[PDB]
Design an enzyme around this catalytic site. Structure first.
Site, PDB file in Angstrom:
ATOM      1  N   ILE A   1      74.190  19.340  27.370  1.00 43.24           N
ATOM      2  CA  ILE A   1      73.952  18.643  26.112  1.00 43.24           C
ATOM      3  C   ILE A   1      72.703  19.224  25.466  1.00 43.24           C
ATOM      4  O   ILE A   1      71.674  19.390  26.130  1.00 43.24           O
ATOM      5  CB  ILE A   1      73.803  17.124  26.319  1.00 43.24           C
ATOM      6  CG1 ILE A   1      75.031  16.552  27.032  1.00 43.24           C
ATOM      7  CG2 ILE A   1      73.584  16.421  24.989  1.00 43.24           C
ATOM      8  CD1 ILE A   1      74.869  16.389  28.525  1.00 43.24           C
ATOM      9  N   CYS A   2      72.796  19.537  24.173  1.00 41.64           N
ATOM     10  CA  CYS A   2      71.656  20.033  23.404  1.00 41.64           C
ATOM     11  C   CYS A   2      70.975  18.839  22.742  1.00 41.64           C
ATOM     12  O   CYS A   2      71.141  18.565  21.553  1.00 41.64           O
ATOM     13  CB  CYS A   2      72.105  21.072  22.383  1.00 41.64           C
ATOM     14  SG  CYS A   2      73.580  20.604  21.451  1.00 41.64           S
ATOM     15  N   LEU A   3      70.191  18.117  23.538  1.00 40.29           N
ATOM     16  CA  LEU A   3      69.487  16.932  23.075  1.00 40.29           C
ATOM     17  C   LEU A   3      68.003  17.085  23.381  1.00 40.29           C
ATOM     18  O   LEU A   3      67.620  17.676  24.395  1.00 40.29           O
ATOM     19  CB  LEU A   3      70.078  15.660  23.718  1.00 40.29           C
ATOM     20  CG  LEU A   3      69.627  14.272  23.258  1.00 40.29           C
ATOM     21  CD1 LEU A   3      70.736  13.268  23.503  1.00 40.29           C
ATOM     22  CD2 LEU A   3      68.391  13.833  24.003  1.00 40.29           C
TER      23      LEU A   3
END
Ligand code: ZN
Ligand code: ZN
Lengths: 82, 148, 109, 95, 88, 99, 110, 93, 83, 99
Positions: free
Chosen positions: B85-87
């Site tokens: 996840i690109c968070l």
DNA sequence: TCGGATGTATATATCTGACACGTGCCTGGAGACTAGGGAGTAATCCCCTTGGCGGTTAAAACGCGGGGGACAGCGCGTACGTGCGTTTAAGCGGTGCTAGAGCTGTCTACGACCAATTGAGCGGCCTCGGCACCGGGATTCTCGAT
DNA sequence: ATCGAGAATCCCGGTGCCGAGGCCGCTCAATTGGTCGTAGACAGCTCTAGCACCGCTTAAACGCACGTACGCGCTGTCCCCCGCGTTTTAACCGCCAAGGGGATTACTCCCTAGTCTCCAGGCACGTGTCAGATATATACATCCGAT
């Protein structure tokens, strides 16, 4: 373990180095102040020399790193290679 | 050190506070590797989709953020091939005081409203930006095929 | 002058030119270095060294010593006012100090 | 094994000293003093020239760069004398 | 008004306050968490995300980083937890 | 009658003699002991040699000579012939390293 | 960082590490430039800029101004006891001087 | 015309990251830009001299760390090197 | 273009505010004359460096960038004018 | 009965008012003319721009303020409040800026 | 202690120019591939650096008598702060000119760059004399008695 | 002002020594000569702002008057470094030992410069919107003479 040997730069030694400066009479309590300023300058230059040594993975510091330490400090020195 | 106590406190908290529409816990005896089972939000192209996550807790936890990878393959703009996840909190804005509940709230709010500005898979994010609704059908069908 | 010899000889200098040219090449100062740059810089150092050595030699002859010592260098640096400004920051090894006492420092009868 | 070859300006400054004083000796301490001095002056002038060339987006340190550098770093009398000497040297080399 | 142990636990590792440090936002965190935070994290407050690095560098020389008063209070009133946590 | 010199004249003799000489004025072994003290306070098990110790010693002497020139100038400006500590820190402040 | 995105975002910083790397290459500082040096340099620059801006914002909030002005920067630099040491020999334009008064110059207590 | 190079947007971005409300002025922005340039020049020149000292030819992260250790005062340099280590660690992984 | 009488153009009250910003309260009359010489030497050095840079740079219009370079080289670096 | 202020109080008010402010003190046109005088002395038919002389005047302001602060210190050292020329030369000598 | 006079701080309109934001774009930044040469690493060897006595001994340490001098205090004339009426030019706006800073297509000669090589330059050896050390003699201040 | 005894200092003659300088052999960096991509002078065109004037208004400087705070010259004091003699102590030279890491060389490998192709981040530009300078209108801390 070496501690509290600042008296190596002693009363006659600092007196003589002062007399080199042209003073005749000096108050008897400037000795602690001049020892303190000598100190602070000394650990400044020693910080510079030792970190210069750290950069090279070197276990010993040579005159070359400390003369460049002086070079950067604004106290350029002659007589030890450059 | 205190990491074991932190993990015990986190598992106790999730026991007292099961996340809404999701859940998490230890995948086994090991404390660093954990498994999470989440259900896709209704206000999202993944209505009712069930997803699995494997989480590795680092040595410097909670100060170093744990690494999470979606076990099931998800076709999402914020989900890459291996399910990461690109968070922001995952690698950059990580805060030790944040628990699994708040980060899970962040990820559910991210999945419900995908953002193609900073994606991991470019093509799906671009097609989402061009037309969100074809992306809606395709993601719905995919989360139907593997989550059921 | 057109010649096939050492650059110092053809230019009528003493300091090396090829060595200074190489030092400019591998000293990280420019991508490309002109041909006249090394000879010009060598001439500049040539003048500086000639002047400092002749002044030091004159000072040593005043002190009846024909072999130069760093004290003579320190006197050469400090006795002149312009070159002292040029080399104000530097410290000379074994240099000592310029002999000088302020007027008010001297005692009174 | 072989000792790594080192560099010094000893022979050249000795030639200059003999040219200006044919009966004057030089000790090792002052000899190293002169070596350090010439290295320091060379570094100063070259650094000033490089800084000026970058300040003028110029890729070449031509003779004019060192001309300006020596005109700056040297006070009046030494500046003009060194400029004259360098111009003499460069015109002799190119002639 | 002496707070209980739960109020005397830090906000990160759930352990007690040892050598507590008080932030300008009146936030307190046990000393090892602060050490492993300020040099090994985002330099911000673990509660309000405020950049408190300037306060840290200001107070590092005078050793005013640690809150002496509340440390003395907790040592007088909760010494056994401090002795237990002395060895991590 | 025992002979005692007037104070100040032998002071001038010492000043002239030292301004004429160039030998080291600090004992090398105590200075290197201090150097090693700050070294061990900075990194344990560090090594020096004689040349570096001489370099630091001479840098120290030059710096202190300059500082004492400045403090003598300050003291003589203060209508005195004795250098006081206040002169020392004032000369340091004007030089531009402490402020 | 497995993200093959913009290098500044890959490192998680704001200053352009690519521009810093270009300036290192074209600065004529060394023949070769390491790939990790620009990241380190950009991080150091960003930290310094961030702390200067934080202290200047504190000064402005003290002045009740919502727009940083060179006076705020001057106060921030001189107030700090080591940023002064770093930049004491330096001068800031239109910044003025720190407000200080000598004790002796104060009027006689009457 | 020409395209001038400046750090204005980056300083504004880091300001908004650290202060969400307070604005900036043109003169203050110029001061910040020139200050960043000056610190860049100092650190990079020191690193180049260090690389030249060891007869090396490559400016790596360690030379930058040494240069920032020399230039900045004690704990400022400590914070700078900590930040650099964190940044390079994040870049690697 | 003929132009003269530079230094006495500066006003004694200008040196007065300069001292006041310095923080000194009581000013002698002899200060004003030597302050003029101080400005003499400082300005001549700075603009000598500046005109050297300009004449080197094929340009005879002394820009602010060059004077900033002069101050930086002298160690009295000034900010807010580029670079 | 005019309200003639005692010598010093309005001086301190004026100190505070010019010390809290950053507005330029040296008058614009005379300083610009003086700078042009010295420039055309060094090089005839030389043209300036506004920003250059602005920077020159800012640098002059900074130098003068620093020198006058150093004068304050060295003068108050002598237990005086009136700054003499000797303060100015001593301050310039300690900094060593006159070679 | 003390009540006006002074400047300073506080509350409010307003209008202004500066700052923040949206757009076009285009050039600098980014991703992929290659080669190689610079840097990391293993092995060694030897220079010197720490370490240690041990004798000699110049110099640090201490006491003490004392005299030059920092310091405390008084007055007194003076240059300096403070205020006012006066004069002067500094600053603002507005115009006009053009000379020079700055950008553009370009041609060329200054110089990057590589094979050959050789002799200038450097490492090592050898030699004597400029100078260090010492003893003795003559010359220069110096301080107490006038 | 003076001279005389007393230390303090420059000088001459002698003797020795070690390092400054000259000489020899050898290796590698400078020199020759050739090629070739390219920074840079260079003539030419655009267009920005710096100079110069010019009128005007008004804030700042000037010259003077005046009262005076103190800079300083002088006096009086006790106190605190200096010189010198006497005692101890670590400095200082000389010597020898061990090993350790500084320095050097040989081998290998992988990071990065260089090129190529592709793309979007940041800057120039224009324009909307408000932070605060300015201006006016209030209330209060403070100075100093007066008590
Ligand atoms: Zn904790
Ligand atoms: Zn907080």
């Amino acid at each position: 373990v070496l501690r509290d040997n600042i008296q190596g730069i002693t009363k006659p030694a600092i007196r003589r180095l002062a007399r080199r400066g042209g003073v005749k009479r000096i108050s008897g309590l400037i000795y602690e102040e001049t020892r303190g300023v000598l100190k602070v300058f000394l650990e400044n230059v020693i910080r510079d020399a030792v970190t210069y040594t750290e950069h090279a993975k070197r276990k010993t510091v040579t005159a070359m790193d400390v003369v460049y330490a002086l070079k950067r400090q604004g106290r350029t020195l002659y007589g030890f290679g450059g | 050190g205190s990491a074991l106590k932190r993990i015990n406190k986190e598992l106790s908290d999730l026991a007292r506070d099961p996340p809404a529409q999701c859940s998490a816990g230890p995948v086994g005896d090991d404390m660093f590797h954990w498994q999470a089972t989440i259900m896709g939000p209704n206000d999202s192209p993944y209505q009712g989709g069930v997803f699995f996550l494997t989480i590795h807790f680092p040595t410097d936890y909670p100060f170093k953020p744990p690494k999470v990878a979606f076990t099931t393959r998800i076709y999402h703009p914020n989900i890459n091939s291996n399910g990461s996840i690109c968070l922001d909190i995952l690698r950059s804005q990580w805060s030790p005081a944040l628990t699994i509940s708040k980060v899970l709230l962040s990820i559910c709010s991210l999945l419900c409203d995908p953002n193609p500005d900073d994606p991991l898979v470019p093509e799906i994010a671009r097609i989402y930006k061009t037309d969100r609704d074809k992306y809606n059908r395709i993601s719905r069908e995919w989360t139907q095929k593997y989550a059921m | 002058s057109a010649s096939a010899k050492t650059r110092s000889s053809r230019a009528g200098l003493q300091f090396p030119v090829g060595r200074v040219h190489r030092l400019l090449r591998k000293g990280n100062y420019s991508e490309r270095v002109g041909a006249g740059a090394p000879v010009y810089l060598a001439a500049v150092l040539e003048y500086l060294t000639a002047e400092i050595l002749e002044l030091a030699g004159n000072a040593a002859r005043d002190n009846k010593k024909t072999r130069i010592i760093p004290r003579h260098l320190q006197l050469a640096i400090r006795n002149d006012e312009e070159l002292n400004k040029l080399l104000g920051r530097v410290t000379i090894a074994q240099g000592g100090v310029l002999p000088n006492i302020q007027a008010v420092l001297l005692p009174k009868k | 094994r072989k000792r790594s070859r080192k560099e010094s300006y000893s022979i050249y400054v000795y030639k200059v000293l003999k040219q200006v004083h044919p009966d004057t000796g030089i000790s090792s301490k002052a000899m190293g003093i002169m070596n350090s001095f010439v290295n320091d002056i060379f570094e100063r002038i070259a650094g000033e020239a490089s800084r000026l060339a970058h300040y003028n987006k110029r890729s070449t340190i031509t003779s004019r760069e060192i001309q300006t550098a020596v005109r700056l770093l040297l006070p009046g009398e030494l500046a003009k004398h060194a400029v004259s000497e360098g111009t003499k040297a460069v015109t002799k080399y190119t002639s | 008004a002496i707070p209980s142990l739960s109020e005397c636990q830090c906000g990160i590792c759930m352990e007690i306050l040892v050598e507590p440090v008080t932030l300008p936002c009146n936030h307190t965190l046990c000393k090892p968490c602060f050490q492993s935070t300020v040099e090994k994290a985002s330099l911000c407050c673990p509660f309000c995300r405020r950049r408190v690095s300037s306060w840290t560098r200001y107070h590092t020389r005078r050793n005013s980083l640690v809150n002496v008063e509340l440390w003395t209070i907790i040592q007088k009133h909760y010494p056994r937890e401090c002795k237990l946590r002395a060895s991590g | 009658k025992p002979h005692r010199y007037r104070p100040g004249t032998v002071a001038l003799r010492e000043i002239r003699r030292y301004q004429k000489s160039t030998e080291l004025l600090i004992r090398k072994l105590p200075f290197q002991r201090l150097v090693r003290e700050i070294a061990q306070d900075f990194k344990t098990d560090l090594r020096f040699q004689s040349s570096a110790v001489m370099a630091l010693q001479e840098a120290c002497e030059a710096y202190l000579v300059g500082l004492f020139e400045d403090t003598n100038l300050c003291a003589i400006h203060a209508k005195r012939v004795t250098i006081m500590p206040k002169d020392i820190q004032l000369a340091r402040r004007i030089r531009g390293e402490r402020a």
